[PDB]
Amino acid sequence: FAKASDIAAMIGGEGNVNMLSERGSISIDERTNSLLIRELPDNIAVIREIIE
Amino acid sequence: KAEIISSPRLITTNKQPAYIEQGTEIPYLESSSSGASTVAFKKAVLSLKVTPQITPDNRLVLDLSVTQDRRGETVKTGTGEAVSIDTQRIGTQVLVNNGETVVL
Q1: In chain B, what's the furthest Cα-to-Cα distance?
Q2: What residue stretch is flagged as signal peptide (chain A) (predicted)?
Q3: Residue of B49, B51, B45 whose CA lies nearest to B88
Q4: CB contact under 8 A, B15 and A1
């Protein structure tokens, strides 16, 4: 129901101060409308709940 | 009385941009960069330009451009002349069920 590029630009983005991350990272897969995230297994759950 | 109908079609892959066109390209006198003229081409086409996206509950989100332009009269510009264009354009984003029609 939403574009993955917009969501990746909102969750991550310019600089690390804005990012909701510490020392991981989002990537986009446009072919299948998906995000690929690498972070602490505790931040994955809150990110998942918000973007759901 | 008068009545006209036109309908283009396309097939494409999900999340992938596609276009189909039919018309003319008008050569215009000059395009300006830092110093000189790259004379260019304006389009007067009947065109469809689309990017689709499939969602879970049997629905599509479409990013749509549909145009139908023609070549118009030749107006006067400076000491010269040039060709004008007559246009109809619509651009939107809509959300439509799988196999039915909507009026944009």
Answers
A1: 61
A2: none
A3: B45
A4: no
Which experimental technique did the depositors report for determining this structure? cryo-EM
A51 in helix, strand or coil?
helix
Instruction: Give CA–CA dist B35/B19, Å, rounded.
Output: 34
PDB resolution in Å: 2.7
> Parallel, antiparallel, or unpaired for β B70-77 and B80-86?
antiparallel
Bridge partner residues of B61 (DSSP): B53, B95
- Among chain B residues, the shortest Cα distance to A30 is held by B15
Place of tokens 């941009």: B17
Q: Could you tell me if A35 and A20 are in contact, meaning their C-beta atoms sit under 8 angstroms apart? A: no
Which residues of B are less than 8 Å from A1 in CB distance?
Answer: 55-56, 61
* Residue A16: φ, ψ to 5°: -90, -15
How many whole angstroms separate alpha carbon B50 and alpha carbon B71? Answer: 24
